[PDB]
Structure formats: structure tokens, C-alpha cells
Amino acid sequence: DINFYTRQVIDPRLCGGLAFSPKLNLFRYLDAMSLSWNRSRLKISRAT
């Protein structure tokens, strides 16, 4: 007769990925043109 309970991690070093990793599809996304708001910042700084 054996009766006990255990809980184990998903060892995220090995497993834990295999997902979408929402970094991508957003880092390759507008991060450049949104950064390009340097144009507007320069505009406001000129009149500042």
C-alpha cells in the first residue's frame, strides 16, 4: 500500500518555454517608429 502526494516545478531552465514568449511580435513591432518620437521631442525641445 502506497499513498502520498508530491508537487514538482517545471524546471524552467529546461522546460517552461515552449510558449509564445510575448516578447516577440511586439519587439519586432513598432519599437523603432515609436522610438522615432525623437522628432516630436526635438520639436518641443526647440520651442522649450
Binding site: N38, L42, S45, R46
Partner: protein
């Protein structure tokens, strides 16, 4: 009374003196500035490999 008759000449002479002092000081403290901005680029070589 004789001394209080001073206002006649001291008040407006002093007022005009302060007027000329202001009209010279405002022009004298102009503190002119001139500035410009550019967005020149900086290039750093990236190894092709």
C-alpha cells in the same frame, strides 16, 4: 511747512531719475542667446560574420 514744500522738486526729479534708470537697465540686461539643433547620425561598424 517750508521743508515739506520739498515734494515740488524732489518727487518728480526722483521719479524721472528712476524712469531713466529703468529705461537704460532694461535695454542693458538683454542677455542675448543663440542656439540650434541638429540630428546628425553616428555610425558604428558591425562585424559581418
Amino acid at each position: 511747512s517750508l521743508w515739506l514744500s520739498f515734494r515740488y522738486e524732489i518727487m518728480p526729479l526722483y521719479y524721472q531719475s528712476q524712469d531713466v534708470l529703468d529705461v537704460i537697465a532694461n535695454s542693458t540686461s538683454e542677455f542675448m542667446t543663440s542656439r540650434d539643433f541638429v540630428a546628425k547620425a553616428i555610425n558604428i561598424g558591425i562585424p559581418l560574420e
